[PDB]
Design a protein around this nucleic acid. Structure first.
Ligand SMILES: [Mg+2]
Ligand SMILES: [Mg+2]
Ligand SMILES: [Mg+2]
Ligand SMILES: [Mg+2]
Ligand SMILES: [Mg+2]
Ligand SMILES: [Mg+2]
Ligand SMILES: [Mg+2]
Ligand SMILES: [Mg+2]
Ligand SMILES: [Mg+2]
Ligand SMILES: [Mg+2]
Ligand SMILES: [Mg+2]
Ligand SMILES: [Mg+2]
Ligand SMILES: [Mg+2]
Ligand SMILES: [Mg+2]
Ligand SMILES: [Mg+2]
Ligand SMILES: [Mg+2]
Ligand SMILES: [Mg+2]
Ligand SMILES: [Mg+2]
Ligand SMILES: [Mg+2]
Ligand SMILES: [Mg+2]
Ligand SMILES: [Mg+2]
Ligand SMILES: [Mg+2]
Ligand SMILES: [Mg+2]
Ligand SMILES: [Mg+2]
Ligand SMILES: [Mg+2]
Ligand SMILES: [Mg+2]
Ligand SMILES: [Mg+2]
Ligand SMILES: [Mg+2]
Lengths: 169, 200, 172, 98
RNA sequence: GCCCCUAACCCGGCCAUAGGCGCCGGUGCUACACCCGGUCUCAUCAGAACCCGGAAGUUAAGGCCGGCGCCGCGCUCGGGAGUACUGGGCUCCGCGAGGGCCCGGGAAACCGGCGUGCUGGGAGGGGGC
RNA sequence: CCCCUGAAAAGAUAUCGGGGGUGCCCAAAGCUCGGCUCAGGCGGGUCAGAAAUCCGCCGUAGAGUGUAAGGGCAAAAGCCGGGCUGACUGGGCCCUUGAACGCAAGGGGCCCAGGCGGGAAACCGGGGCCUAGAGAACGCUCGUGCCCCCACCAGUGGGGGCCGGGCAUGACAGAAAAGUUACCCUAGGAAUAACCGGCUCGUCGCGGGUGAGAGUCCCCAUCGACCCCGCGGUUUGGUACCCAG
RNA sequence: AGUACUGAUCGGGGCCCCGGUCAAACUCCGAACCUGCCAGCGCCGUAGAAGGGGGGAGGCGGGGGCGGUGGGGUAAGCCUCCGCUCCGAGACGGGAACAACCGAGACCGGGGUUAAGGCCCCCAAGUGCGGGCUUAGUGUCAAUCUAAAAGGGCGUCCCCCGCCCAAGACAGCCGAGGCGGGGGGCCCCGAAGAUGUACAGGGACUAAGCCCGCCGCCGAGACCCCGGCCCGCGGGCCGUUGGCCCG
């Protein structure tokens, strides 16, 4: 994988129609909603924290997965799976491309340089706008310090600056 | 009906009165249409010009008009169809209509049907209607000889069935076996009334 | 019937690098040189043109006394000759003030007579015959604020209101 | 790859209909009678595409010059070049604007 | 003949405000129907349909009219919102992708409210010329 | 050559841009008239079954329409049946190929005349529902005409001509055409590679944030998974700006 | 914009309903905007519009800025389209230098006034005016042009919120304010290179820096004026393969 700065900016149209894309990669995020997901038990939670994007850009699938792991592990350890609801709010629909010389990927991929430059699929990313919610947490007011810490850890894994907004439901 | 993508058909199509595929081919002629429609009890004949905002009926009549010439046969048989075309034909001619195109709507063009009897009456009044020579009913059927022959057979087989099946004929004072004689009388009165009108 | 307000329009920015659609409109408004000035009747078709050239000109409601001074100092007739009181009187206008007031108030709908206008005898024309339909001004004494910013945020471009008369007096 | 130029080569949007316009169109356009000098608007009907004029003439105003059987001979312009469009009334609308 | 007024019927235009589901009523001299038959014209496996000949029965159904409810749909109505977006100018900000200011335009979803066919010609009926 | 996208709501629009297709096939899959309604679901019905034929209800097209893609189509443009050959002879005009603006072949549309097919009629038929399946000159060959010409005249054989169909150039606006040079030569080119330089930094090297986990206990003595922010110009590449007297 | 057709996609509830994430090759809706005809305005046109004919070309390598996330690409002073303008073929002022950034379009001479930009010295014009901030020589008035991120800092200036104290609050009886959270400005750390100094013009400056405002002045070939010259077009006079005069 290239450094994430290579795919951070929105430089072209969304590339999502998988029926026209050969070898589009499979999404490598196993779950998107963590903790207590049933709507009845979520009624106990009365606070909402959001990790909100500050800039527009593309977040790679592995960064979303890395952010999801660190925050969910922290909440499981310190808050408890029965006392919170955490949702990864964006889905990596956009397919990333790379122009590299490769074997077993088509004859055109054997031409070097910028000849036949249209890249083969290299991964997935979510295209986000300023103010967009990346992570969404529902919790009880007693755990505010722990929820803020979990979202601070998630933010350290993401390629764009974010900010934490805490509001009641 | 169910959902926004449902397309409701044209009002006259969902009422089942207008075949828009056939109507379009009629309008391409740019000629007046002889509209002939059948009801249970009457026949309707209209001469219609189509206009973008709606059709214009130059002359329209149903078979109730036959009582104005002392008609005593049934309202909508083959004989009544011919007399209706004659009245419509002369009225249409007085308004400047020389040629028309037959429009039968959803009725079938079976040979000898009443729609072609109205056409035959319209033709004899001087309005030209293109047609094939194998669909006009025979003169015997136009004169009602098929009605008279049926009743004559009924009387000598079951005299009571003659009384029920033609009760209204007996009420009007014209027994069905005398229909061809009366049809000539009514036809003469209609023709004379309009040739004199045309002459004046 | 309707008498539209009379506006003075001054071209503030130059010819080279002016965008094409703005340059075309300025030419039709007779502002074909920098610091050229015209007076127009503010009909909706005219105001649509001024909006198009808003970033290249400054404009506002011109007053009759300012117009009287402009005519006396920068008014030119055919041959690039000065406009004089005697020339006005020959045509039936008593003074610069009277013709300027006639135009500002709406008594006449044009200041310079059209190209195809034909002068009659005895009748005072509803304009000044053979006046050039534009004025060539001096640069403003004391300068401007900025020819690249709009007057509404401290520059000089765009709608100026009655302050166009203060600017004109400095440009005479 | 260069643009291909079939007779209908960039006409997906133009020849598409909204759901509420699906099916046959009304017949009133058939019943207008145009005389020489009338102004018409070329409004392509996608249910009769074979008789429709080229996409470049959609929305143009023409003048009726005469008739040819059932079609109308229309004089119009593409930019600066005079073009003759011969088309049936289902692809025409009266121009009320003068 | 002519002009005016006017149900259900005939020929239309626009083609859901007209469609869909459910419930409650109205209409029958005439008109529309359901209806009665199959000798004749015509028709099929089938007189069911089509076609022909009728008038015993009925407003039960269709058609047309009125009301209520829900769905769907419509609206030059309120909010959403001068928001999103955008034509022109800028030695205005930002490391940058980008944003901002001024002049000129300006939505959509959605929420609420209102609406639920309108209309052209003809027959028939009424009034006069 | 053709469709969608790119393409920025008139028109035009490129890249060794993206997703596909074409060099056919069909005497019906062509013309016309009539009737009918599809995929799918439910209820009932002898074998019989998820699926055969039968009765009924629902069913906006979720089917079909030869063939790519897009578009169109429900008393039809689909399915079935009846009758047919217009996939016609002689011509004209227009649209597109080819934007405004010159310019092939090909394709499409509207008509006039001749003579037909279907149909009660209206009307429709000069192939396929629409947008692809397409070939100059010279030469040859066939069709056609009471046809024109062949050297002083007439005749016989033969030859030529005008009009139309075909035989082909796919590098498709049309030569008939294999290598090799490190033995090499000439004209030139920084319109164009190799070295260095310029730009870029994926790669390379170096730094930082994060802290799962390891470290007896203990995140940070020492480390640092999963990820993320950078710097350098030190490897390699990308590009082709300068330099081929 | 929507997720209603075709597709993608995360959850909840009972194949349906509700919420959520998306679409270059999806679209119920739908701008700004562009474009057709007519009428008007504006301007051009009898000193000749439209249209047409004839002779001669050059040229058929383009380039810069800005805008379409244009499309591609890690990116490129990169490749390939669309539009306005400029360089090529354009002098001159500013930008330290510099085709295309800003200003602006140059016949010749002179006077005047402005534009961009600047006014401590170099260098024409202010050691100009009020308020506030920075202590790092940070920085030193857009772009080409020589820079900086995630992250850390009550370093310092400031704004808002929650709670405690009704003098029995915070800190170890005393007597007045105190504790926590969120944000903003400037600066500090993060911040490492090769011939020669806090480089980005130099001197140097604690303002001669930065932020909110303000006043005057300097400053082009631009604009105004005077004189001289030339030109295009029209008119006139002269025995003219031409000359002269006027507008
Ligand atoms: Mg891009
Ligand atoms: Mg400029
Ligand atoms: Mg081309
Ligand atoms: Mg065809
Ligand atoms: Mg277009
Ligand atoms: Mg095909
Ligand atoms: Mg059919
Ligand atoms: Mg070509
Ligand atoms: Mg052209
Ligand atoms: Mg072709
Ligand atoms: Mg001889
Ligand atoms: Mg070629
Ligand atoms: Mg060297
Ligand atoms: Mg190199
Ligand atoms: Mg690396
Ligand atoms: Mg650490
Ligand atoms: Mg290198
Ligand atoms: Mg080069
Ligand atoms: Mg060099
Ligand atoms: Mg969206
Ligand atoms: Mg456009
Ligand atoms: Mg070239
Ligand atoms: Mg360019
Ligand atoms: Mg050159
Ligand atoms: Mg300089
Ligand atoms: Mg000095
Ligand atoms: Mg960066
Ligand atoms: Mg420094």
């Amino acid at each position: 994988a290239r450094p994430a700065r290579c795919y951070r900016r929105i430089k072209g149209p969304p590339y999502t129609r998988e029926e026209y894309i050969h070898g589009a990669p499979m999404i490598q995020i196993p779950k998107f909603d963590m903790g207590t997901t049933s709507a009845a038990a979520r009624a106990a939670f009365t606070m909402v924290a959001k990790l909100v994007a500050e800039e527009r850009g593309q977040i790679r699938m592995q960064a979303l997965e890395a952010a999801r792991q660190i925050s969910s592990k922290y909440l499981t350890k310190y808050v408890g799976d029965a006392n919170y609801y955490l949702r990864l709010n964006v889905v990596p629909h956009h397919v990333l491309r790379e122009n590299r010389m490769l074997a077993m990927a088509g004859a055109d991929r054997l031409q070097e340089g910028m000849r036949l430059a249209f890249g083969s699929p290299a991964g997935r990313a979510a295209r986000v706008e300023p103010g967009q919610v990346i992570f969404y947490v529902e919790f009880k007011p007693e755990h505010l310090a722990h929820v803020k810490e979990a979202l601070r850890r998630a933010a350290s894994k993401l390629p764009i600056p974010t900010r934490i907004v805490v509001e009641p439901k | 009906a169910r959902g926004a993508r449902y397309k409701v058909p044209f009002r006259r199509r969902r009422e089942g009165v207008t075949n828009y595929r056939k109507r379009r081919k009629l309008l391409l002629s740019r000629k007046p249409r002889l509209v002939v429609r059948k009801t249970n009890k009457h026949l309707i004949a209209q001469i219609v010009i189509a206009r973008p905002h709606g059709d214009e009926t130059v002359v329209g009549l149903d078979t109730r008009v036959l009582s104005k010439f002392g008609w005593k046969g049934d309202e909508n048989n083959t004989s009544a169809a011919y007399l209706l075309g004659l009245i419509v034909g002369y009225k249409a001619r007085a308004k400047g209509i020389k040629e028309a195109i037959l429009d039968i709507g959803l009725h079938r063009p079976t040979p000898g049907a009443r729609v072609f009897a109205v056409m035959k009456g319209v033709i004899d009044a001087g309005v030209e209607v293109p047609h094939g020579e194998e669909v006009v009913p025979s003169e015997e059927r136009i004169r009602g000889e098929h009605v008279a022959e049926y009743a004559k057979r009924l009387k000598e087989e079951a005299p009571e069935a003659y009384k029920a099946r033609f009760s209204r004929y007996l009420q009007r004072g014209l027994p069905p076996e005398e229909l061809p004689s009366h049809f000539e009388e009514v036809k003469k009165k209609i023709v004379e009334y309009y040739e004199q009108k045309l002459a004046k | 019937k309707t008498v539209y307000p009379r506006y003075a329009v001054i071209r503030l920015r130059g010819i080279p690098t002016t965008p094409g659609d703005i340059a075309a409109t300025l030419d039709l408004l007779r502002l074909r040189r920098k610091f050229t000035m015209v007076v127009v009747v503010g009909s909706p078709s005219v105001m649509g043109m001024i909006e198009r050239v808003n970033d290249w000109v400054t404009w506002g409601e011109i007053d009759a006394d300012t117009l009287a001074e402009v005519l006396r100092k920068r008014g030119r007739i055919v041959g690039d000759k000065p406009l004089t009181l005697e020339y006005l009187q020959k045509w039936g206008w008593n003074s610069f003030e009277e013709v300027a007031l006639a135009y500002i108030s709406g008594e006449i709908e044009t200041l310079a007579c059209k190209k195809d206008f034909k002068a009659r005898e005895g009748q005072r024309p509803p304009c000044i015959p053979y006046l050039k339909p534009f004025f060539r001004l001096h640069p403003p004494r004391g300068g401007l604020n900025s020819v690249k910013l709009h007057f509404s945020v401290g520059g000089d471009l765009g709608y100026r209101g009655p302050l166009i008369n203060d600017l004109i007096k400095r440009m005479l | 790859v260069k643009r291909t130029h079939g007779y209908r080569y960039k006409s997906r949007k133009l020849l598409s209909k909204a759901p509420r316009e699906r099916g046959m169109s009304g017949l009133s356009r058939l019943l207008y009678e145009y005389k020489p000098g009338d102004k018409v608007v070329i409004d392509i009907d996608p249910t009769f595409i074979s008789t429709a004029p080229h996409r470049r003439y959609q929305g143009k105003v023409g003048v009726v010059i005469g008739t040819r059987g059932r079609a109308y001979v229309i004089e119009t312009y593409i930019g600066d070049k005079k073009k003759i469009i011969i088309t049936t009334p289902e692809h025409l609308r009266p121009h009320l604007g003068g």
